[PDB]
Each structure stands twice: as C-alpha cells, then as structure tokens.
Amino acid sequence: VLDLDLFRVDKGGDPALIRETQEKRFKDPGLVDQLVKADSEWRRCRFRADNLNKLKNLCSKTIGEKMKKKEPVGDDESVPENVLSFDDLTADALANLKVSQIKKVRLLIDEAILKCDAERIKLEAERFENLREIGNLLHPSVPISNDEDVDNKVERIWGDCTVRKKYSHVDLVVMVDGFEGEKGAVVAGSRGYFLKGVLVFLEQALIQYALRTLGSRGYIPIYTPFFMRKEVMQEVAQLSQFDEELYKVIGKGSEKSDDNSYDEKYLIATSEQPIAALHRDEWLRPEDLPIKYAGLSTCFRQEVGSHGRDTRGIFRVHQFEKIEQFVYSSPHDNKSWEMFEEMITTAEEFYQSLGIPYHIVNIVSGSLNHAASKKLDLEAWFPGSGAFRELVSCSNCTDYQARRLRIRYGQTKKMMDKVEFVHMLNATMCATTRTICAILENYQTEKGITVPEKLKEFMPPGLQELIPFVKPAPIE
Amino acid sequence: VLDLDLFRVDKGGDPALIRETQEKRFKDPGLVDQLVKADSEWRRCRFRADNLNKLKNLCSKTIGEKMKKKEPVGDDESVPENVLSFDDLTADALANLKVSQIKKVRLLIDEAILKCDAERIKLEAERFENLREIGNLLHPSVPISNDEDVDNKVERIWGDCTVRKKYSHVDLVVMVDGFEGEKGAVVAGSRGYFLKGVLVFLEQALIQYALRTLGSRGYIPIYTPFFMRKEVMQEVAQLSQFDEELYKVIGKGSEKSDDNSYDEKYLIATSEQPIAALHRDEWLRPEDLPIKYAGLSTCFRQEVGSHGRDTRGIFRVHQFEKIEQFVYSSPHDNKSWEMFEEMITTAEEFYQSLGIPYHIVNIVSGSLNHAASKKLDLEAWFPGSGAFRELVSCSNCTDYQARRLRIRYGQTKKMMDKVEFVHMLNATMCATTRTICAILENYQTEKGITVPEKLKEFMPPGLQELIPFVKPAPIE
Numbered sequence: 001v002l003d004l005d006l007f008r009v010d011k012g013g014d015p016a017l018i019r020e021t022q023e024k025r026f027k028d029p030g031l032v033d034q035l036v037k038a039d040s041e042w043r044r045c046r047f048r049a050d051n052l053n054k055l056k057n058l059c060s061k062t063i064g065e066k067m068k069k070k071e072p073v074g075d076d077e078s079v080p081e082n083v084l085s086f087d088d089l090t091a092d093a094l095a096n097l098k099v100s101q102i103k104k105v106r107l108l109i110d111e112a113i114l115k116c117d118a119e120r121i122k123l124e125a126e127r128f129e130n131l132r133e134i135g136n137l138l139h140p141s142v143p144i145s146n147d148e149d150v151d152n153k154v155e156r157i158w159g160d161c162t163v164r165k166k167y168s169h170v171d172l173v174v175m176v177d178g179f180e181g182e183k184g185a186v187v188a189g190s191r192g193y194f195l196k197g198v199l200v201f202l203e204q205a206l207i208q209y210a211l212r213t214l215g216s217r218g219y220i221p222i223y224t225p226f227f228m229r230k231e232v233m234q235e236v237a238q239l240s241q242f243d244e245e246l247y248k249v250i251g252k253g254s255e256k257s258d259d260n261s262y263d264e265k266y267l268i269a270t271s272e273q274p275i276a277a278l279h280r281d282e283w284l285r286p287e288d289l290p291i292k293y294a295g296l297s298t299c300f301r302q303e304v305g306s307h308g309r310d311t312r313g314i315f316r317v318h319q320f321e322k323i324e325q326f327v328y329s330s331p332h333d334n335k336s337w338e339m340f341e342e343m344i345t346t347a348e349e350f351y352q353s354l355g356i357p358y359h360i361v362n363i364v365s366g367s368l369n370h371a372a373s374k375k376l377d378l379e380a381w382f383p384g385s386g387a388f389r390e391l392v393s394c395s396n397c398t399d400y401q402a403r404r405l406r407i408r409y410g411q412t413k414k415m416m417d418k419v420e421f422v423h424m425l426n427a428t429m430c431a432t433t434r435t436i437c438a439i440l441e442n443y444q445t446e447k448g449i450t451v452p453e454k455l456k457e458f459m460p461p462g463l464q465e466l467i468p469f470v471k472p473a474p475i476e
Numbered sequence: 477v478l479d480l481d482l483f484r485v486d487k488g489g490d491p492a493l494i495r496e497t498q499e500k501r502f503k504d505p506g507l508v509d510q511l512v513k514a515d516s517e518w519r520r521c522r523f524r525a526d527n528l529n530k531l532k533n534l535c536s537k538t539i540g541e542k543m544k545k546k547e548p549v550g551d552d553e554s555v556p557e558n559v560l561s562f563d564d565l566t567a568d569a570l571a572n573l574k575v576s577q578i579k580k581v582r583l584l585i586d587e588a589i590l591k592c593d594a595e596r597i598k599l600e601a602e603r604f605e606n607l608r609e610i611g612n613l614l615h616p617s618v619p620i621s622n623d624e625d626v627d628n629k630v631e632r633i634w635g636d637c638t639v640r641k642k643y644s645h646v647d648l649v650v651m652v653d654g655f656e657g658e659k660g661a662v663v664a665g666s667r668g669y670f671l672k673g674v675l676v677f678l679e680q681a682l683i684q685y686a687l688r689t690l691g692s693r694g695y696i697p698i699y700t701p702f703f704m705r706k707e708v709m710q711e712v713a714q715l716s717q718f719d720e721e722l723y724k725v726i727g728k729g730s731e732k733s734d735d736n737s738y739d740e741k742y743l744i745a746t747s748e749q750p751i752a753a754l755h756r757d758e759w760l761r762p763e764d765l766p767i768k769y770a771g772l773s774t775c776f777r778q779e780v781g782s783h784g785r786d787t788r789g790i791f792r793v794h795q796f797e798k799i800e801q802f803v804y805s806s807p808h809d810n811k812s813w814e815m816f817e818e819m820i821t822t823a824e825e826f827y828q829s830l831g832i833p834y835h836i837v838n839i840v841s842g843s844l845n846h847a848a849s850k851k852l853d854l855e856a857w858f859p860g861s862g863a864f865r866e867l868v869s870c871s872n873c874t875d876y877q878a879r880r881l882r883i884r885y886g887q888t889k890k891m892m893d894k895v896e897f898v899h900m901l902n903a904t905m906c907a908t909t910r911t912i913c914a915i916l917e918n919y920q921t922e923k924g925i926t927v928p929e930k931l932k933e934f935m936p937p938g939l940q941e942l943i944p945f946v947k948p949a950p951i952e
C-alpha cells in the first residue's frame with residue numbers, strides 16, 4: 001500500500017500526482033478524491049475524540065475537587081439539558097451541578113467516546129477501501145498504455161525465434177504418455193490433469209536444477225505453506241485476485257470436537273505471497289540485506305479471466321509447481337533496481353543453459369498489478385505453436401508490500417521522522433508445467449524429445465539421453 | 477462399498493454375518509437392520525412403479541382401440557372417483573369410460589409415477605446412508621479389538637530399537653536451521669511451517685530416491701490433482717473424513733465473469749484418493765493387471781482428532797509431501813493378498829536401505845477405516861523421542877473401492893450373473909516430513925546429521941557427506 005502523507009496537502013505530498021499515476025495505470029482516479037475526503041472526515045473525528053477526552057477529564061477533576069471539600073453529593077441524579085454540548089459543558093457550568101449529576105454526564109461522554117471510536121474505525125476502513133485499490137508509483141521506463149500487443153517494448157532477444165517444428169505441446173504431452181486430461185477432468189473438474197511417468201522425472205529434474213542454480217548464488221531454498229489465513233492473504237493480494245485467482249479454503253479453526261466455528265483460508269497462487277508474509281511485522285537489519293529466497297511451492301489459480309484459452313495442454317492449468325525468487329532489498333540508493341536487473345538475468349541465464357529461445361518484454365502500465373512498479377516478462381519462443389508464450393514475470397514492488405506487512409528497514413545510524421520500509425521483489429525462476437511445454441517443443445525430433453544438457457544429471461538411468469515417443473499424436 | 481446381495485435373504489447372502497463384522501469393527505450393528513428395512517421398502521416401491529406402468533399402458537391401449545372404432549370422444553372430462561385405485565382401474569372399468577375421461581386418468585397416473593420415482597430416489601439415498609457407513613469384510617488374521625496399545629500384534633522387527641540418542645526431532649529441525657514454526661503459525665495458522673535450506677534438499681533427495689526405487693520395480697510415477705470434486709471425493713472418503721480430515725475448497729465452477737455460482741471441492745489427504753478415481757467407471761483388462769502407480773502429491777489434513785499432539789515439530793502437520801504405492805489387482809486367487817505382502821516389503825526394503833529401525837504392526841479392527849480389510853503399519857524407532865512412531869500404512873481395500881467407483885474386472889472368457897470388481901490396494905512409500913524426523917534422530921552426531929548412503933547421490937555438492945549444526949538447541 002502507498003504512504004498516506006502523499007495524499008495530504010499539509011505534508012509534502014500532492015494528491016494530483018497520484019491522480020496522474022492512476023490515469024497511467026488506466027484505473028479510476030476518483031479513488032484519490034474519495035481518499036482525501038475520507039481522511040479529512042477521519043481527521044475531524046480525531047479532533048472530536050480529543051475534545052471528549054478533555055471534557056471527561058474535566059468532569060473527573062470537578063468531582064475530585066468536590067470530594068475533597070465534601071459536598072452533599074446530591075440526590076437529584078437527573079441530567080440537565082443546558083449543559084450537554086461542547087460549548088455548554090464548561091468549568092463554570094460543572095461547578096453549579098452536583099456530584100451525582102456530573103457522574104451521569106461522564107457516563108454519556110463515555111458512550112459518546114465509544115460511538116466516536118466506532119466512527120473512527122468505520123472511517124479508517126472507508127479510507128482503506130480506496131487506499132487498497134491504488135497502484136504503486138511507476139518507474140520512468142514503464143510504457144504508459146492499455147494495449148499489450150502494440151505498446152509492449154521488446155528489450156533483449158536470445159536464440160533463434162523463427163525456426164518452427166513439427167508438433168505443438170498439446171500433441172507432445174500425450175505422445176510420450178505423460179498426460180491424462182479426460183481422467184483429470186472427472187477428478188478435479190475442467191482443466192484438471194494427471195502428469196505421469198516420464199514428465200514426472202522431467203519436472204523433478206527442473207526442480208532439482210532450479211534449486212541448485214539459485215542455492216549456489218546465495219539464495220535460501222524455502223518450502224512454503226500452500227494456504228494462508230484471510231487476514232494475511234488480504235495483505236499480499238488485491239480484491240481482483242480474490243475474484244478471479246484465489247481459491248477459498250474452509251477449515252474448523254480449532255482441532256477440537258466441541259468446536260463448531262469455521263476459519264476461512266485461501267490457497268496460494270504464488271510462493272511470493274507466503275514469503276512476503278514471512279517477515280511480517282519485523283525490523284530487518286541493513287547488514288542482513290539483501291535476503292534472497294528460493295521459494296518452492298504448488299500454485300493454485302482459478303483462472304476465471306480466460307475461458308477457452310489453452311484448454312488442451314498443461315500450459316494453462318489450475319495447479320502447477322513453481323520455483324520463485326524473492327529478495328528483500330535496501331530502499332536506499334538504487335539497490336532494488338540493481339537487484340531487479342540481477343533477478344531477470346538469473347532467469348535469463350537459466351533458460352540460456354537449457355537452450356530455450358526468448359525475448360524480454362517491458363509490460364505496459366495498464367496490465368500491471370497494484371504492487372509492481374515495473375514488470376519484465378521472459379516470453380519463450382514456441383516452435384510448434386508458432387507464437388511467443390509467457391514463462392517468467394519479474395516485478396519490483398518496492399516499499400508497497402513492506403508498508404502493508406509492516407516490514408521496516410531497521411537502521412541504527414539515524415533518528416528519522418518517518419519509518420522507512422524495505423524494498424521487495426519477486427520473479428519466477430521456473431514454472432514447471434510451462435517450462436516442460438517449452439522443452440518439449442524446442443527439443444522435439446523424430447524419435448522423441450532430447451534431454452537438455454543441464455537436465456541430464458537429474459534424469460533417471462534410461463531416460464538420460466532422450467525421452468522417446470510411445471503413443472501416436474492425438475488425432476481428431 | 478459392500479455388495480447389496482449380502483444383505484438380502486432372497487439371495488445367497490445373510491444380514492447376520494454383516495452384523496458380526498460391524499461388532500468386530502466396534503461400530504453400530506443397527507445400520508444393517510436399517511439397510512434391510514430400507515431395501516424392503518424400496519423393493520415394494522419398485523412393484524408399485526411396475527403396476528403404474530401397466531395401468532398407464534392399459535389406459536393407452538383402451539384409447540387406441542376406441543380411436544380405431546372412433547367413439548364420440550366425450551365432453552364430460554370429469555374424473556370418476558370409483559376407478560382411481562389399483563383394484564378398481566380394470567379393463568372393464570375403462571371400457572365404460574369415454575376417451576376424454578381416460579386421458580384425465582393417465583395424467584394422474586403420470587403424476588403418480590413422478591411421485592413414485594421421487595420416493596424411489598429417496599429410499600435409495602436412505603439405503604445408501606446406511607450402506608456408506610458399513611465397513612469392509614475383515615481378513616481372518618486381523619486382531620479383533622478396540623484397544624491399539626494392548627492388542628496390536630507385532631509381526632517383524634528390524635534393526636536396533638533400544639539405542640537412544642541425544643536430541644529429539646523437535647530440537648534437530650531447528651538446530652540445522654530448516655524450520656520456521658512461529659512464522660508459519662502467523663501465515664497459515666497453528667501447525668503451519670516453513671521448511672528452509674538444507675531440509676528442502678533432503679526432502680527432494682527422498683522424493684527423487686522413492687520415485688526411482690518404485691519406477692525400477694514396475695511402478696508408474698503419477699502426479700495427481702491436489703483437489704477433487706464433491707461427487708468424486710464422497711466416493712473415496714467416508715463421512716468421518718469430511719468431519720476431521722478433509723479441507724473444503726470453494727471455486728466458481730465456471731471461468732466466466734457472468735457466472736455467479738459456486739462449486740464445492742475438497743483438498744486431498746492422500747494420493748490414494750485421486751488415483752482411486754483415475755479408473756472410475758472403467759473396464760480394466762485382466763492382462764493389464766496388476767497396474768502399479770507411484771503417486772506423488774502434497775497431502776492436506778485438518779487433523780481435528782488430535783489436539784496438543786506433536787505441536788512443535790514437523791511430525792504432525794496440516795501439509796506434507798508423500799510418495800504413494802497404489803496397485804489395481806485381480807480379484808481371483810490370492811493375487812491381492814500376495815500384492816499386500818509385496819507392497820509392505822517394498823516399504824520395508826526402502827527404510828532398510830536408509831538404515832531406519834522399525835517394527836511391523838497388525839492394526840486392530842476397531843481402528844480400521846471402512847475401506848481397508850487389513851492394515852499393516854511400519855512404526856519406526858525414534859531414538860531421541862524414545863518411542864515408536866508411525867511412518868507407513870499398508871491397506872488392502874479389496875473390491876470395496878472398486879464397487880463404489882465402478883471399476884470392473886473386464887474378463888472376456890466367461891459370461892457371469894454378477895459383475896466382478898477389481899481389488900485395490902494403497903500403501904505409503906515415503907512420508908517426507910515424518911521420514912526426515914526419522915533420519916534426523918537416527919543419524920544425529922556431535923557435528924550434525926549424517927547423510928544416508930542412498931541419499932548421498934541426490935544431495936547437492938557441499939551437503940553430500942553430512943548436514944552440520946548451525947544453531948543451538950531451542951532452549952526453554
């Protein structure tokens with residue numbers, strides 16, 4: 001989430017600058033105006049809460065002074081009308097009233113404070129609704145457009161991206177007998193699949209290779225929970241992700257037979273989400289940064305946005321394994337942006353060793369999520385399909401995620417007015433199911449699929465040289 | 477589920493024999509009496525449906541004959557009372573009535589058939605409620621008791637099961653820095669964990685070894701869906717598993733923005749469940765049997781039955797990877813029981829090569845699930861803990877699961893009166909999280925944990941010889 005002082009004119013920030021970034025992202029700029037209005041109404045609520053505290057203390061002071069002098073207390077006990085306001089409840093007005101009457105006034109103030117606090121919580125939630133759906137500040141190099149096909153700038157190109165081959169990944173996944181779509185459609189519903197035999201070893205070869213490649217570079221391999229609590233998932237995901245991406249999990253909340261309540265959880269769509277929440281509410285040391293993680297988890301995506309899109313193969317599925325790069329970086333200097341170029345090259349040198357052709361793409365601001373400031377995608381060339389397909393997404397989220405999860409840059413050299421949060425970045429190293437599709441199409445021959453040089457070590461004896469065809473192409 | 481002809485006295489079966497097996501399992505025998513009563517009431521409903529069809533055809537016959545002779549049809553159109561019963565609606569009674577009247581009678585019969593069919597469905601569902609919660613026929617060698625600690629017979633003992641070591645798995649998981657419990661408790665809720673660094677490679681070594689061990693023995697490695705549809709999950713799991721084991725998943729059911737409906741799914745607790753449903757509604761060839769699968773999936777368990785049980789380590793968790801043996805066997809001869817002893821020895825020779833001490837246990841009938849006819853558990857010796865802990869469960873479910881999922885033994889040599897279903901078996905090869913606990917406690921030294929001879933091949937360079945301590949023991 002963004003800093004609130006940017007929305008306030010009393011501080012150094014300006015609301016019009018945030019309105020521009022919303023127009024660049026091609027999203028509603030009226031959320032900025034709703035933010036300022038709610039914050040101004042919240043501010044007035046705080047002034048009312050302070051006045052109620054001052055009047056509560058003044059009521060206690062007048063009683064305390066009258067207890068020392070020991071007034072007859074009073075048996076009236078009826079609340080006077082001519083004193084129940086901010087202007088009327090004064091020191092002189094409270095002096096005329098008896099102890100039993102002032103106690104009745106304080107009780108009404110106590111009820112007013114609880115009502116004011118309920119208003120204060122409501123206004124903060126109303127403010128947060130607008131603040132949640134405002135995207136991060138964009139990098140100057142990000143192309144400002146809503147169209148992807150036209151305005152996505154190609155940065156780097158590696159390998160031959162014109163040579164086309166025999167079969168598509170759809171036919172190749174069946175020919176080697178490592179796919180059961182019709183059976184998976186009955187078991188898990190549409191798009192569900194069973195990966196069998198040879199492709200299980202290929203996936204395990206990719207996982208074993210990706211972890212060793214990152215592990216030697218200083219990354220810490222990390223296996224994460226596959227589901228998260230609602231309170232924590234809302235901090236790492238936006239409202240749209242709850243609508244068209246995240247699965248909802250229902251649990252008991254307690255491991256007791258007497259319990260009848262239910263806790264609502266959510267399946268993760270990325271290793272990014274749980275690793276982001278790993279250092280939640282923490283003060284990270286500058287000396288420890290940059291902390292690098294090699295996330296390993298199964299990802300669950302509802303994929304509601306696309307219907308009739310890659311419905312045959314394992315390219316677009318509800319369930320897939322993915323090795324993730326996650327780096328906690330220093331906010332100062334250009335550390336995060338230097339890491340941003342470091343993480344994409346780590347993904348580049350990964351697919352270069354596997355012999356996969358690709359091009360690097362700078363994604364338009366309109367297709368960027370609220371967290372990311374700049375995204376780079378590695379779109380690999382698919383010879384059988386004849387088109388470029390997305391394999392990697394590299395994003396710098398800066399201090400957006402860190403502010404929400406309260407992950408601070410715990411420096412000890414300066415005393416600051418505002419707390420500085422760390423910079424957080426996420427990039428995928430290898431998406432198993434989609435990487436397999438890239439390997440099958442690029443290494444296809446007359447006999448089968450040739451095992452890449454780097455993956456030969458992790459393949460079992462008998463499948464180290466090549467993965468041969470055993471079934472004919474699924475004909476229509 | 478069990479065969480219905482066993483409950484019927486008209487067939488060769490006897491209900492009293494099923495009452496005995498329910499008492500042996502220490503479960504309600506009154507479900508057998510409720511089954512017979514519902515089946516008898518269902519039988520009478522079928523006789524009523526046949527009579528309604530005969531009267532419907534008799535109404536159509538009388539009209540058809542009167543259409544040929546061309547009667548004045550009739551303008552009465554009022555339904556007579558003296559004919560609206562099974563005894564009163566006869567050929568002579570329908571002859572007196574006019575065409576317009578008989579058409580009104582047939583419409584009431586059509587409404588009666590729909591009401592009778594609704595009763596027929598209700599009675600079948602009422603019959604199934606009792607049939608679902610009746611366990612499989614027990615093997616003669618299964619000990620009949622409700623107590624596990626007293627009556628569980630120990631079959632085989634391997635290795636030294638008396639030698640105790642320094643630290644428990646709880647301390648060992650933290651000392652090598654591969655566990656984050658407090659962080660996982662915030663992310664996923666209680667019992668949630670992050671496995672990091674060295675233990676990620678250990679898990680990957682176990683997965684890579686278990687798949688190659690089974691793959692060379694004729695098993696087909698299979699990656700399964702992690703969630704299943706309600707209709708299919710109910711066929712592989714009992715009502716108790718929905719109460720204290722299975723997580724509920726909420727999805728849209730359709731990948732469209734216009735859709736507002738929701739489909740209820742369930743996370744798998746075993747690879748057994750999706751692999752059992754793989755050959756759902758199929759006719760398996762005798763020549764193809766035995767079909768052997770090496771299941772690989774993440775298992776999700778709610779673990780509601782146990783509170784305050786192994787709450788510190790990774791031994792009892794909501795989420796764990798597991799390699800599963802699943803065999804479709806021939807019902808004839810002793811093929812399934814020969815495979816039952818083959819699958820347990822496959823699990824035995826697995827932990828013998830890893831150098832883990834254990835004993836084989838025959839579990840009492842009272843603790844067996846509805847599917848299993850006989851269960852054998854491999855309880856490994858834990859030196860640091862000082863007790864035997866469960867790692868493997870080997871079960872022969874026979875034709876219980878196959879009847880429910882309609883998986884038939886498709887023979888072509890004989891013409892039979894009743895369809896014979898295949899025998900299905902399930903046994904775990906390696907439960908990653910619990911196997912790690914067994915390795916850490918058995919291979920602990922002064923420096924760290926020694927890498928087992930078989931796992932040395934799959935460990936990364938630098939962690940092939942030993943996994944050293946980096947942190948002190950979590951002291952209280």
Ligand SMILES: Nc1ncnc2c1ncn2[C@@H]1O[C@H](COS(=O)(=O)NC(=O)[C@@H](N)CO)[C@@H](O)[C@H]1O
Pocket residue numbers: 269270272301303314315316317318319320322324390391392393394426427428431433434
């Ligand atoms: N439905 C799907 N089926 C299979 N693979 C997918 C699916 N959706 C995404 N992927 C793969 O997994 C990666 C996820 O990256 S991403 O969704 O674009 N963005 C992120 O989540 C970033 N945190 C990088 O992981 C993609 O690069 C893509 O290769």
Ligand SMILES: Nc1ncnc2c1ncn2[C@@H]1O[C@H](COS(=O)(=O)NC(=O)[C@@H](N)CO)[C@@H](O)[C@H]1O
Pocket residue numbers: 745746748777779790791792793794795796798800866867868869870902903904907909910
């Ligand atoms: N809550 C848990 N946390 C970690 N591991 C578990 C948990 N529950 C069971 N396991 C492990 O996973 C295995 C599952 O086997 S089982 O539940 O007993 N029965 C089955 O599911 C059989 N189909 C064999 O897999 C057990 O042998 C045990 O070693």
Ligand SMILES: [Mg+2]
Pocket residue numbers: 269270
């Ligand atoms: Mg995402």
Ligand SMILES: [Mg+2]
Pocket residue numbers: 377390393
């Ligand atoms: Mg994209």
Ligand SMILES: [Mg+2]
Pocket residue numbers: 745746
């Ligand atoms: Mg089970």
Ligand SMILES: [Mg+2]
Pocket residue numbers: 853866869
């Ligand atoms: Mg057991």
